[PDB]
Amino acid sequence: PCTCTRCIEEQRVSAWFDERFNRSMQPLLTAKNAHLEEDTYKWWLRLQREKQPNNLNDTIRELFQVVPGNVDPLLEKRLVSCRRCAVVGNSGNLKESYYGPQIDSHDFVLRMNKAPTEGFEADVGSKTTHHFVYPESFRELAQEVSMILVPFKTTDLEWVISATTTGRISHTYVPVPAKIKVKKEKILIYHPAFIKYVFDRWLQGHGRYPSTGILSVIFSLHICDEVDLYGFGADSKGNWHHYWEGVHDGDFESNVTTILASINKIRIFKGR
Template identity: 50%
Template sequence: MATRARAAFVSRHQLVLALLSTLLLVCIWYFGSQPGRSSDPLPVVPTTLGCTTRARSSTWFDNCFNSSLSPVWTPANKRLPPHVHDWWLGLQQQGDVGLPVVLAKLFRLIRARKRAATERSEIACLTCALVGNSGNLKDSGFGHEIDAHTYVLRMNRAPTLGFQRDVGSKTTHHFMYPESATNAGENCSHVIIPFKVLDLLWVISALGKGWITKTYAPVLRFLHTRPENVHIYNPAFMKYVHDNWIDGHGRYPSTGMLAVIFSLHICHMVDAYGFGADERGNWHHYWENNRYAGEFRLTGVHDADAEYDVLLQLAALGHIRLRRPS
């Protein structure tokens, strides 16, 4: 009888030890696999890509890149240096009537309630897919690869519906100015590029009662998004792109060039899609049937060749990867 009791006790003791061992293994696996733990110092980010690229050192890049500048205009940096103020207001020559009052009202409206995806994290591996509008995206099949990035940046009226196989469907940042604005989704960051005080007023209008329907061209009446998802491109950053990166070529940088440098400031790895001409040397948009449209190069406002040269140089140094169909 005593022998059976002793055997039962030993059996129960072994069972308890086995359960405790299993629980310990589960705890080790769970806590060891959590973001920020010692076995995995980088938090998990929603991407299937890794920050595996290493840029080569370059005096040119070091002279161009200014990490102290924020790409986004906020209450903290709302006061523009005089040379930036004058340059910015001269772009479309409409003056600064009411600028301080407009900015105060705008920043009250769009005050972010959480950390915005407009800053580079020093602990996460953040990857950007910068999607241009070139016709070379047609039949590229890049859609799935694009959507695998942490951030997907698009611009102006670029559509995704009907083109998902080539351009993807995910959008986290959409760059636009009032005359090119589109509703990019309630949870998407709408990055507004202002060229005049009226553009700032348009943001207030589009998030409110929609009283502005035209500037020099018809504009979108409403932005269907939360105010905290609207970010204003910093005119000082725009001037920095114009001066440092494209050496003053063109009247001001294109939306694409502004997005390129923006992405360098918020991501550790940047893949650029849909930039440059197609395989026949034509410049047009991927959603256009007219292969010979090329209106970007005909505006006279931007220097497409100078901007593309910067893109090629960034790619050669490993700061971006220029993705084109093989």
């Protein structure tokens, strides 16, 4: 049992939560766990429908010649008794929220997409432990930050290989960076099967596939004991914009987070 006030894993608090949460899921890819079931693989290929993708097992073998192939799938949660995490979305409800110090007080701070901290630190914090990206939504990261690649197609895994070595992939469905500066040892890979678990069990099949925001939340339910959300949802005026500047069912995903908050499995900080 964790030593926090409450523990996300705890069963028999909410049967709605217990129906959905599966403690056996592994959120990160490793050489050990990389075999996909045929149904999961076919579903994952259908997300972006690449023509004639390379063999996935060959692609993953080549990937783990480059980035670490034996990460602990819960990032060494077994060595801590209360891991507290902040998941920071991109909403302009963070503007003038002054949430930075409270965000930075957490053990892990998880960010996503091209969201910057520089010049926004009083609102969004300066700490990042983990940052979710995909080739089409990447920005250079500070050297301490773990990069969590979320792969939506075979080419996303080939892009990690390329962008840290030969720099041969510069376009997917849009232009993508040919090179990144992230150290290979700092790269983590979101497991495809965990994407499908989010879609089937948490989203009950709503949307074409899950948004990055909700993938980040459910990932954090597994790796953390206590989760606080910042920068999710609209602002107080009903605007959806980013704090610095038809694929997903954002209303259904929103409602999952609202329900999670109502049963004290997360806390949501609404901002401004």
